[PDB]
Amino acid sequence: MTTAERWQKIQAQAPDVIFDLAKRAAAAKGPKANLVIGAYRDEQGRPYPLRVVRKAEQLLLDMNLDYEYLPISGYQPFIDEAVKIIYGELENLVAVQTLSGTGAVSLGAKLLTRVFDAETTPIYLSDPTWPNHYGVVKAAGWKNICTYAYYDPKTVSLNFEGMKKDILAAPDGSVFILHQCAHNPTGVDPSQEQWNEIASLMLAKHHQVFFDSAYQGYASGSLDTDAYAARLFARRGIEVLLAQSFSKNMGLYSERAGTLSLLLKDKTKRADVKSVMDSLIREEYTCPPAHGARLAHLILSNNELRKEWEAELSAMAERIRTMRRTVYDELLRLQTPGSWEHVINQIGMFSFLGLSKAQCEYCQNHNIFITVSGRANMAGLTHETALMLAQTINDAVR
Amino acid sequence: MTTAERWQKIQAQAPDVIFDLAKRAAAAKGPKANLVIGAYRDEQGRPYPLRVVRKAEQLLLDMNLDYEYLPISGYQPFIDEAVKIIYGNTVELENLVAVQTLSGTGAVSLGAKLLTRVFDAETTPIYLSDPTWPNHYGVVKAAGWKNICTYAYYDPKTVSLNFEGMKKDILAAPDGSVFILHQCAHNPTGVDPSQEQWNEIASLMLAKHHQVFFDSAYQGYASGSLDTDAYAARLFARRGIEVLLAQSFSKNMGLYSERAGTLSLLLKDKTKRADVKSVMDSLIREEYTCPPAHGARLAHLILSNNELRKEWEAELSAMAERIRTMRRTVYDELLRLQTPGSWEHVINQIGMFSFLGLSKAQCEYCQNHNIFITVSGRANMAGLTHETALMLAQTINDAVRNV
Numbered sequence: 001m002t003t004a005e006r007w008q009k010i011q012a013q014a015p016d017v018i019f020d021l022a023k024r025a026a027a028a029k030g031p032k033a034n035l036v037i038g039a040y041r042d043e044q045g046r047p048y049p050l051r052v053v054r055k056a057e058q059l060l061l062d063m064n065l066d067y068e069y070l071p072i073s074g075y076q077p078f079i080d081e082a083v084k085i086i087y088g089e090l091e092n093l094v095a096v097q098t099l100s101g102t103g104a105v106s107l108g109a110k111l112l113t114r115v116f117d118a119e120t121t122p123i124y125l126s127d128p129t130w131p132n133h134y135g136v137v138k139a140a141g142w143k144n145i146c147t148y149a150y151y152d153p154k155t156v157s158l159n160f161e162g163m164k165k166d167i168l169a170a171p172d173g174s175v176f177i178l179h180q181c182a183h184n185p186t187g188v189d190p191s192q193e194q195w196n197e198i199a200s201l202m203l204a205k206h207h208q209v210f211f212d213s214a215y216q217g218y219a220s221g222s223l224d225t226d227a228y229a230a231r232l233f234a235r236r237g238i239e240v241l242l243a244q245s246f247s248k249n250m251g252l253y254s255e256r257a258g259t260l261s262l263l264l265k266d267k268t269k270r271a272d273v274k275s276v277m278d279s280l281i282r283e284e285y286t287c288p289p290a291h292g293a294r295l296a297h298l299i300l301s302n303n304e305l306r307k308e309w310e311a312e313l314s315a316m317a318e319r320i321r322t323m324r325r326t327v328y329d330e331l332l333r334l335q336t337p338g339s340w341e342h343v344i345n346q347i348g349m350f351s352f353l354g355l356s357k358a359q360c361e362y363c364q365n366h367n368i369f370i371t372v373s374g375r376a377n378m379a380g381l382t383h384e385t386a387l388m389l390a391q392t393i394n395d396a397v398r
Numbered sequence: 399m400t401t402a403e404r405w406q407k408i409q410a411q412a413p414d415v416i417f418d419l420a421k422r423a424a425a426a427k428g429p430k431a432n433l434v435i436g437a438y439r440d441e442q443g444r445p446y447p448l449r450v451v452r453k454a455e456q457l458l459l460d461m462n463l464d465y466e467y468l469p470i471s472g473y474q475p476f477i478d479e480a481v482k483i484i485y486g487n488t489v490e491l492e493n494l495v496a497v498q499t500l501s502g503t504g505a506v507s508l509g510a511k512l513l514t515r516v517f518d519a520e521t522t523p524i525y526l527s528d529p530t531w532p533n534h535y536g537v538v539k540a541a542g543w544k545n546i547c548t549y550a551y552y553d554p555k556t557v558s559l560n561f562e563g564m565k566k567d568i569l570a571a572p573d574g575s576v577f578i579l580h581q582c583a584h585n586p587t588g589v590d591p592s593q594e595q596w597n598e599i600a601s602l603m604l605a606k607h608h609q610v611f612f613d614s615a616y617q618g619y620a621s622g623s624l625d626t627d628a629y630a631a632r633l634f635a636r637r638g639i640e641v642l643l644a645q646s647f648s649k650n651m652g653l654y655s656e657r658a659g660t661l662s663l664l665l666k667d668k669t670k671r672a673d674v675k676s677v678m679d680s681l682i683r684e685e686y687t688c689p690p691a692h693g694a695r696l697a698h699l700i701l702s703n704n705e706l707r708k709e710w711e712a713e714l715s716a717m718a719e720r721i722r723t724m725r726r727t728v729y730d731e732l733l734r735l736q737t738p739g740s741w742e743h744v745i746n747q748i749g750m751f752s753f754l755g756l757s758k759a760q761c762e763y764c765q766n767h768n769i770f771i772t773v774s775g776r777a778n779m780a781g782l783t784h785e786t787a788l789m790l791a792q793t794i795n796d797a798v799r800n801v
Contacts, residue, residue: 001574002607003640004666006516012673013680019470039466047464061455066445067655068437069648072417099500099686106685115404132683139684173399208401239401247467254465254691264405272410279411282533283540284507285500289690290655 017131018371025369032367033385035377038184038215038349039253040316045382048316050251052309056298065294070287072278073097074259078293081300082259085223086180086213086230086244094270095261096277097288101214101245102136104260105177108210108241109140110280111260111273112175116208118142123175124166126150128373130184130212133177148176151186153354156342158188167201175208180242181226182215185375187346189219195229199236209233211242217249219347221317223310239263246296248349249313255292316379320349323381327351330390336397349379359396368392416532416772423770430768431786433778436585436750437654438717443783446717448652450710454699463695468688470679472498472660476694479701480645480660484614484628490635495671496662497678498689502615502646503533505661506578509611509642510541511681512661512674513576517609519543524576525567527551529774531585531613534578549577552587554755557743559589561598568602576609581643582627583616583749586776590620590748596630600637610639615646619749622718624650624711640664647697649750650714656693717780721750724782728752731791737798750780760797769793 018036025034042048073079074097083095098104112118118141125133127147137145148170149162167176178198183189190198202209211230219226233240239262246257260277264270281287299305324344331340343351353374355363360372368389370376381389416434423432440446471477477496485491499505513519519542526534528548538546549571550563568577579599584590591599603610612631620627634641640663647658661678665671682688700706725745732741744752754775756764761773769790771777782790 002666003574003609006574006609007640007663007665007670007674008667010515010670010673010677013676015676016470016679016683019683023469037467047466049462049464053465057459061459064447066447067451067652068445069435069654072414099690102687103685114408132687135680135684139681173401173404206400208404239405251465253467254688256686256688256690262405265402266406269405269408272408273405275411275413276408278414279536280540282414282417283536284504284685285657286503286533287655287657289500289657289693291692292690 021369021371028367028369030367031388032369033381033388034369035380035389036369036371038248038377038379040248040251040349040379043319043382045385048251050309050312052299052305052312053251053295055305056295059298060294067290070097070290072281072287073274074288075290075293075297077301078257078297079259081297082244082246083261085300086216086227086242087234088224088227088231092265093261093263094274094277095259096274096281097293098243098258098260099285099288100247100256100258101212101243102132103256104243104245104258105133105136105212106140107260107277107280108243109137109142111276112208112210112241113141114276116173116175120144121174122146122170123177124148124170125177126179126183128185137177146170151188156188156354158190158194160190160194164197164201167198167205167207170205170207172206173208174205175210176202177210177212178229180211180213180216180229181219182348184214184348185350185352185373187348187350187352189347190229192228195232199233199238202238203236209238209240211240213242214245215248215348217313218317218320218349221314223313234263246292250296250299250309252292252295255295256289257292257296320379323378323386324351326383326386327378327381327390330387331393334390334394336394338397349377351376351378353393355393355396362396363392366392366395419770419772426768426770428768429789430770431782431789432770433781433790434770434772436649436778436780438649438652438750438780441720441783443781443786446652448710448713450700450706450713451652451696454696454706457699458695465691468498468691470682470688471675472689473691473694473698475702476658476698477660479698480647481662483624483701484617484631484643484645485635486625486628486632490664493668494662494664495674495678496660497675497682498694499644499659499661500686500689501648501657501659502613502644503537504657505644505646505659506534506613507537507541508678508681509644509661510538510543512677513609513611513642514542515677517574517576521545522575523547523571524578525549525571526578527580527584529586530578547571552589552753557589557755559591559595561591561595565598565602568599568606568608571606571608573607574609575606576611577603578611578613579630581612581614581617581630582620585615585749586751586772586774587753588747588749588751589753591630593629596633600634600639603634603639604637610634610641612641612643614643616649616749617645618650618714619718619721621748622715635664640666647693651697651700651710653693653696656696657690658693658697721780724779724787725752727784727787728779728782728791731788732794735791735795737795739798750778752777752779754794756794756797760801763797763801764793767793
């Protein structure tokens with residue numbers, strides 16, 4: 001058998017649904033709205049490097065830094081500042097830099113196979129969730145992937161009774177992947193009181209909590225407010241594993257800046273956990289890229305840049321709210337059948353519109369690129385495309 | 399059982415031996431030579447951001463670029479230019495499938511995973527050189543390879559390739575095994591096959607229908623010429639081998655911290671390239687979604703811009719030459735001190751390292767005297783200065799005589 005014959009037999013894999021549709025949207029001719037990937041655009045619909053990031057790039061260049069290898073764990077000042085934005089002592093936690101949020105979810109999922117039997121232990125995702133959760137957790141070796149009830153499309157709200165039921169029905173010592181805020185795709189989060197109840201269930205059932213924190217800042221417009229869940233779980237004594245991204249809230253999508261952190265009381269065990277994290281990193285990519293981490297560190301740590309960043313993120317969230325309102329008002333003007341309050345009540349970057357698969361296909365075929373599940377990036381809208389979206393929905397629904 | 403009690407059961411792993419000794423070396427006080435990690439240092443022993451890279455940082459900043467996600471496969475202009483330096487502007491460039499990776503380590507890991515979709519990784523041997531980069535073993539294991547093997551390669555008695563043993567092991571392997579080959583600048587020994595040995599190795603890989611996986615982390619350092627250093631990969635391509643290749647820009651461009659690499663396959667069947675790419679992307683997406691852009695953008699600018707490109711090649715050639723001057727300095731001093739034994743390997747070995755031949759106890763000695771080579775006798779010759787070359791030749795001379 002020749003190598004060519006072996007390669008002949010390789011099994012193709014389907015394209016990533018989201019990235020492929022973004023490609024289609026980017027390639028489309030004529031008036032259009034590319035509303036696929038949750039990336040922020042400005043008032044004119046332009047890609048938007050943050051002003052604080054522009055400043056940071058110059059400040060970094062002026063430092064005449066070298067390009068020597070980071071430690072396997074990454075750039076420590078970045079790790080330290082990043083963990084502080086989520087939790088508000090660093091001796092209680094063990095953390096490394098990761099290839100953004102995705103890399104954190106992967107490394108965490110892998111790490112967890114050292115403490116749970118991933119051949120049989122259920123790992124739970126929300127219904128619905130970020131599609132890549134399935135693929136990441138499966139690649140990390142999880143054979144038993146389950147769901148918890150979360151969203152109820154008929155009422156555009158949480159099916160909280162169902163979620164609780166599923167948490168309690170799970171065998172003791174299961175892993176639950178929770179969105180820390182700005183649930184993707186639904187834009188509906190537990191209330192603070194619901195979070196309290198969820199923490200008590202996780203404790204009572206001895207479940208492992210794994211937070212995915214990709215949009216801190218975008219639920220409320222405030223980083224502090226949006227960290228409510230992770231901080232509550234910490235106060236409760238939960239051994240929180242958390243995957244953090246700076247892609248969306250700092251707009252460093254291309255630079256892949258994230259962390260993975262675990263809360264754990266015992267100092268010796270924290271060292272042991274760090275040694276496993278490092279072995280997993282070393283055997284995949286040796287050490288992480290510095291540029292994203294260095295940009296983020298300088299913004300988080302410089303007093304002026306840090307204040308400027310928070311105000312910029314707040315303004316970005318406000319612009320999303322104006323877009324929701326522009327879409328909603330137009331749906332009302334056109335008298336589009338159904339209720340549309342979820343457009344203005346959902347938070348984060350998206351609306352999860354509730355259209356049928358055929359209706360979403362219709363939108364896409366009329367150059368309004370929302371997903372087949374009905375998710376629309378509100379942060380990708382301008383005034384003009386906000387009206388186009390509403391008008392296309394109106395046609396799709398009738 | 400509480401989650402606190404379950405975490406209690408996690409088992410500690412040993413620290414990375416090379417990154418750990420590098421940390422000790424950097425921490426040590428007094429007259430020292432930190433020769434652990436294979437990272438280039440200048441005439442004064444300082445980290446050396448390349449002049450062309452500094453120029454490229456300004457040109458990128460002036461372009462006022464956004465930070466939107468790259469495609470899963472990465473930045474196509476980088477990828478295209480990067481594979482060109484390995485194969486040249488040739489027919490092979492239309493016959494290949496390539497993605498951006500997290501540097502060379504990322505490419506070795508990704509390639510090792512991809513190969514588990516073409517070969518049975520529970521059974522099929524995957525071969526490493528005796529000895530090799532310490533991280534090869536862990537990378538390949540972690541990708542799912544259960545039968546990791548070695549081929550005879552370095553002979554400490556002759557400071558040379560045991561080429562007869564190498565051929566024997568290539569032939570003794572079952573047909574359709576995987577071989578990881580260092581494209582040039584062998585790590586850790588600095589001993590490469592001659593061009594004539596490479597031609598014989600290609601014939602054996604074709605006869606046995608083995609998969610070749612080149613690890614190409616130092617293109618430029620074996621000779622100071624990118625063209626000369628690409629001989630092995632270019633010969634294998636020309637002779638019809640489906641080369642899988644892991645490329646790094648950490649060393650030849652100094653982009654250690656930015657993690658810029660590629661993984662590429664030459665494929666007989668131009669029509670299965672899409673299928674292979676779909677697998678590569680699936681593996682990437684489930685790990686980190688898409689790669690970091692800054693290193694790829696820097697490297698792309700340097701590769702594609704005519705003036706930067708010419709300037710980079712000059713600069714790399716000058717780096718390679720400084721390494722040679724350090725080897726010659728060590729060697730002339732070993733001759734002068736009439737150190738017992740032969741030392742021509744010092745000047746004949748190429749790339750960043752010397753495998754010096756000292757015993758374990760002799761290397762430990764050197765380490766305790768602040769000459770930080772590895773316990774296997776590996777020395778980063780590119781970390782030397784005139785001054786520390788003499789100190790290395792002297793501490794070697796003390797270690798041979800007294801330990």
